[PDB]
Design an enzyme around this catalytic site. Sequence first.
Site, PDB file in Angstrom:
ATOM      1  N   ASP C 345     -51.961  40.894 -89.222  1.00  0.00           N
ATOM      2  CA  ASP C 345     -52.752  42.107 -89.269  1.00  0.00           C
ATOM      3  C   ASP C 345     -54.221  41.678 -89.206  1.00  0.00           C
ATOM      4  O   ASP C 345     -54.542  40.513 -89.484  1.00  0.00           O
ATOM      5  CB  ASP C 345     -52.434  42.841 -90.576  1.00  0.00           C
ATOM      6  CG  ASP C 345     -53.311  44.060 -90.804  1.00  0.00           C
ATOM      7  OD1 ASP C 345     -53.916  44.138 -91.900  1.00  0.00           O
ATOM      8  OD2 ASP C 345     -53.402  44.942 -89.914  1.00  0.00           O
ATOM      9  N   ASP C 686     -51.675  43.596 -95.317  1.00  0.00           N
ATOM     10  CA  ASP C 686     -52.170  44.183 -96.565  1.00  0.00           C
ATOM     11  C   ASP C 686     -51.920  45.684 -96.658  1.00  0.00           C
ATOM     12  O   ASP C 686     -52.180  46.300 -97.689  1.00  0.00           O
ATOM     13  CB  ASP C 686     -53.675  43.922 -96.699  1.00  0.00           C
ATOM     14  CG  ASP C 686     -54.492  44.751 -95.731  1.00  0.00           C
ATOM     15  OD1 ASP C 686     -55.568  45.234 -96.112  1.00  0.00           O
ATOM     16  OD2 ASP C 686     -54.056  44.941 -94.581  1.00  0.00           O
ATOM     17  N   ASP C 690     -47.711  47.433 -92.549  1.00  0.00           N
ATOM     18  CA  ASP C 690     -47.235  46.062 -92.353  1.00  0.00           C
ATOM     19  C   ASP C 690     -45.863  45.871 -92.997  1.00  0.00           C
ATOM     20  O   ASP C 690     -45.227  44.832 -92.816  1.00  0.00           O
ATOM     21  CB  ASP C 690     -48.233  45.047 -92.934  1.00  0.00           C
ATOM     22  CG  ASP C 690     -49.570  45.045 -92.200  1.00  0.00           C
ATOM     23  OD1 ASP C 690     -49.576  45.298 -90.977  1.00  0.00           O
ATOM     24  OD2 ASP C 690     -50.621  44.800 -92.840  1.00  0.00           O
TER      25      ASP C 690
END
Lengths: 268, 39, 992
Positions: C345, C686, C690
């Site tokens: 990410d 985070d 995700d």
Amino acid sequence: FLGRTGSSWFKIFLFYLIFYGCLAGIFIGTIQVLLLTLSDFEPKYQDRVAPPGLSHAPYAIKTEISFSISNPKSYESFVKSMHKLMDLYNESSQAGNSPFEDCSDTPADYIKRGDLDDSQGQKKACRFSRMWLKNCGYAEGKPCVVAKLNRIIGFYPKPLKNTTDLPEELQANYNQYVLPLRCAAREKIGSIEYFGLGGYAGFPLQYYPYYGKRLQKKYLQPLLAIQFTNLTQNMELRIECKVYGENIDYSEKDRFRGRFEVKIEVKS
Amino acid sequence: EGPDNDERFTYDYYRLRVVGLIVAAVLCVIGIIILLAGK
Amino acid sequence: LDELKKEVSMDDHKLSLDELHNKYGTDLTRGLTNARAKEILARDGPNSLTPPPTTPEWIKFCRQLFGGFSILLWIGAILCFLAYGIQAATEDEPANDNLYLGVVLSTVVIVTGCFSYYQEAKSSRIMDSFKNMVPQQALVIRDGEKSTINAEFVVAGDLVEVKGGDRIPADLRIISAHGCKVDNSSLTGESEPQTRSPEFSSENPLETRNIAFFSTNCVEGTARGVVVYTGDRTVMGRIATLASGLEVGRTPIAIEIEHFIHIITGVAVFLGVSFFILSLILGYSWLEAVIFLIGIIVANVPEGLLATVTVCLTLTAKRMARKNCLVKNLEAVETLGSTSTICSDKTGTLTQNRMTVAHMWFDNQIHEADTTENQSGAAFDKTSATWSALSRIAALCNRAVFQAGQDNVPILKRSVAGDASESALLKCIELCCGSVQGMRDRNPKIVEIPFNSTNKYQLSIHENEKSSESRYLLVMKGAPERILDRCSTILLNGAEEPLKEDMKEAFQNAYLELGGLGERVLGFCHFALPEDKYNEGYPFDADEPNFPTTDLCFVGLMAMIDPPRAAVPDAVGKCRSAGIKVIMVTGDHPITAKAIAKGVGIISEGNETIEDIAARLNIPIGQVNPRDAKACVVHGSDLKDLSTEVLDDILHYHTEIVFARTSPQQKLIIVEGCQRQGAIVAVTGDGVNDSPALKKADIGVAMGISGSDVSKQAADMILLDDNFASIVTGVEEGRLIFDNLKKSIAYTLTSNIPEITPFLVFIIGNVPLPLGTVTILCIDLGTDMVPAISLAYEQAESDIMKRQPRNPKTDKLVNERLISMAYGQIGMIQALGGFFSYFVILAENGFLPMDLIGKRVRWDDRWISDVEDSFGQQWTYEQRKIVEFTCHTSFFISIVVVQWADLIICKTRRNSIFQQGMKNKILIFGLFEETALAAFLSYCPGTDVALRMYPLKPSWWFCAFPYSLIIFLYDEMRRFIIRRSPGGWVEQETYY
Ligand SMILES: *[C@@H]1O[C@H](CO)[C@@H](O[C@@H]2O[C@H](CO)[C@@H](O)[C@H](O)[C@H]2NC(C)=O)[C@H](O)[C@H]1NC(C)=O
Ligand SMILES: CC(C)CCC[C@@H](C)[C@H]1CC[C@H]2[C@@H]3CC=C4C[C@@H](O)CC[C@]4(C)[C@H]3CC[C@]12C
Ligand SMILES: *[C@@H]1O[C@H](CO)[C@@H](O)[C@H](O)[C@H]1NC(C)=O
Ligand SMILES: [K+]
Ligand SMILES: [Mg+2]
Ligand SMILES: [Tl+]
Ligand SMILES: [Tl+]
């Protein structure tokens, strides 16, 4: 193939052949040096045989010899081992002044044939007649058990002195030259009868010390025949034969450390 | 000795055990010292 | 099952308000009926998420109790009770052997069960975190009246109302809104507030303004909407199910464990039954044939090995806990070391997640600011009088403020009330000009025009702090081009000057460059109003232009971005040097995604996309050979119409990959794509978007401070300080533990041979039993334990971060080379050293090696209390047994003595001990404690009864010393060959 190619399969064989060959050669080398540090006449340690064991001829199934008097093949098992032992004490086996000697027909003192050396031939052992074993096919009724003190090189079995009280209090106490053997069971439902050298219920000290198989082959250890002409029948009788001495001790674990454990039963 | 060679069939397993246990303990302490040089 | 959930959603934001009501039998104004709502409740079911069915801990514990070694140990334990049963019936045996050994072995299985159970842990509460995002209550309009209801009682069709501060209770079709802004970070990972209005604004429902989603929250304003989806049927409720439902799967380390279990189990059953028949042929009673088998079992199974592995893992996890890296699953300690691909990410992972000033354009010059958290860069400018003029506008033309009580925390980390751009500017000036509040006290604001959608600028009028003036200063900021159309002069190095086409072109250049860096650019200008035309009491009208807004002085430009975390660029390079492929997977827009990719090193300098080639060469993209482009940037909207085979080609054909504007399922798809190619993949993230990817990853790593609760539930590892450098440490630790496990496994296995061989020679030679069954357990469960563990503290033999990731198909934890060394070479030398001491003990007590062959018959005969030794002496039963057990004791101690050398040689696979040294203090501890244990077990009174351990004479300890030394020399010579010729012979044969 499985793992590798032929060339690799070969190389892995050539390696392990030389490798294990070397290892075998090294192992053998260390065995050589071990033997080189040892005597031919006497073992390095003797503390593990120290207190002599007392073993008998009747091969006990489990410290027991039960049978039927009114049956032939009921005791023919115990007569096999009994014969095996006494067959060794034949007179034809003890011939000539070599390597046997006529010793006192009465319990005598020790005999030192020098040291544990080869500086002399075969150390001459005392003769022993199975004919000293009175009364004892064997006892088809009321067995005639044969006792024996385990051989230990350089061991001098020392009898107890009549200073204080004794089990068989002072009776036929040949204090100086006899290692006594008194069998027991309270529970006194038997009839103990002992046979041996000089008619004594012990081991004649003239058969000691033992010089070992290498320095004394054909050597004969003293026997003590014991007969139980008990007037009882059809019950397990726990009979314990005990030897007494200064060098004799016992253990709760080793039930053969200078004593017997016989469970006779004439179930007839 | 001659007939008095009783020492031949004897071993001081008691002392050996005392010494063996002393050694085991001291090796145990030494180990702690080296380990505890930083935790 | 979950293949449906891996697809993009379909919606009804295209319908009119009225049309949407027909579909749900609803009123736009009155809302549903109390009766109709209750009807729909029973129909559709509750507005709730149901957690997936879990496997009870019962079945989880017992599943370990039947895995190769435990199976063999069970066969042994029962076979003990078998022989015991056969005894209790036949001849009354007052002993406790088979009974107790059967109890001991069964305990070994149970305790070993706890260790593997502890290792195979799965702490997962994904669905629980999602459930925490549904509010307890919602506001609905029913029978023309608004009431709060249990949010679970919400159904498709009713009229819902939301306002700033509340969670969206369900997926809504916006029908009415007033200044409504929403935080869609749940779906995008981006927290910038998104406007919501009734008007449809995009074909894509995840982008349109007239849809509000469950799992998000209203940040400001008010809105009303019609519920279109409830519970599991919402967009993120499906993500919940997808994430919670995904099959966990076996880790790389777990697969390795099972693999050597098969190998060792194989040789165990082989030799087991191979000698069971070999005994019957020799005329051994089944009574004995089973007793030998039990011994064979105990000899072959390394009883303490699986627990060693667990402890080595645990100890490695403890070290990482001490670097702010929490491991939730013990196996994840190793996966990072085996990782070949990282899917990361961007926002809050690679980046700080905070709009930060990156560059400034003043004095016809581009200046760069420091974007790092801890400010690890340098200054750009302080001297220029222009800077102070720009700095003043950035502070004054700003309505952002620091929250109360932050004076303790660093400037860049403190919470700010305001939009992201104003916060960035606030923190910029506060940092390099001190207290901004001071500047706003020295220059009192009298009138302002806040940033307007139409004006595209924000202006402010302040009392000049200067005493010699104390007059009125005008400042404004806004769109760079709009600010330009309102300027006549430029503050160059202090003094103003006319805005000639020259500087105007340099402005465009500066503007284009900063924008190209993916940075948001703002214009700044001011104007000192004429004194005579503006008295100390002159009133300014903010509603109607009461003052000039043209012919102003342009001061400068400022650019900003959500920047990388300080450690990220360097960590990315380090991952790439270790041969790990790094891919970006983000919900953010492509221009921003691509710019950070270059910033952190995902896309290296010079590498191009097909679009880059086309623009440079000024040619159509179809005219570009796509193989000429090693880098690519894929938008989620295009990803959606690509098959997995085509996704696989993208993955294969590019070294530098950026997946932008991806949905949560799309992240999962990319992860699966990478895995499909046979790669071990890590995910770093985070956000809640995700969660699926983190779950599917071989190892998911979540950020601890910035991470959402969901993401940290889905992960195997948490970075508690958000230190991305920890990934680099993690992969390094992972590789080190993999090598050290080999060392520890070889060490443990090596001692199996000296435990097997005595039992074999017992049969083939008919000699007294050299070593007992109990004695074996004193080794594998006792002495070898601490030494085996200590190998986990071994330093690397070379630069492990310099090698490529292991090939999980070829590079195994236990291979043929390990067995050859442990079983064929070193263990064989240990066996002999054991036997030697055995022959020494017996020969020194009177039983010379020659007379031992074929004596066991009379030796074990309990009724022969007169066995003749080599010297003609007669032994009772218990007497010779004491010597025999003393043989077991010295054979045992011989193993310990030969394991000394083995411990030292297993220290290194390649290097010499003279190179690696002896700096492992745990290992040395192992040596001392191992020897202490052995001595204690031999000399402690009473141990001769409980374990049949007998006191050893001093000379006995030294029997195996020459064998211990040969091991040290042999292995040292062998490894000397390895190093001296990287060719292969010694290497490809023995190199673990
Ligand atoms: C040791 O003495 C025993 C005494 O019983 C011998 O047994 C003899 O066996 C033969 C042949 O089987 C019989 O004819 C005799 O009746 C047995 N007794 C005697 C006194 O001769 C036995 O053979 C002897 N063993 C050896 C090796 O000489
Ligand atoms: C007690 C004694 C008699 C048993 C001796 C067993 C010997 C023959 C065994 C023990 C370990 C074995 C080796 C272990 C490892 C390998 C590597 C593998 O890729 C091929 C087989 C090979 C080379 C084995 C061949 C046979 C081997 C050398
Ligand atoms: C033993 O045998 C002798 C003959 O040799 C006999 O006189 C005696 O009665 C026997 N003794 C016993 C107790 O039976
Ligand atoms: K995972
Ligand atoms: Mg993020
Ligand atoms: Tl073992
Ligand atoms: Tl082992």
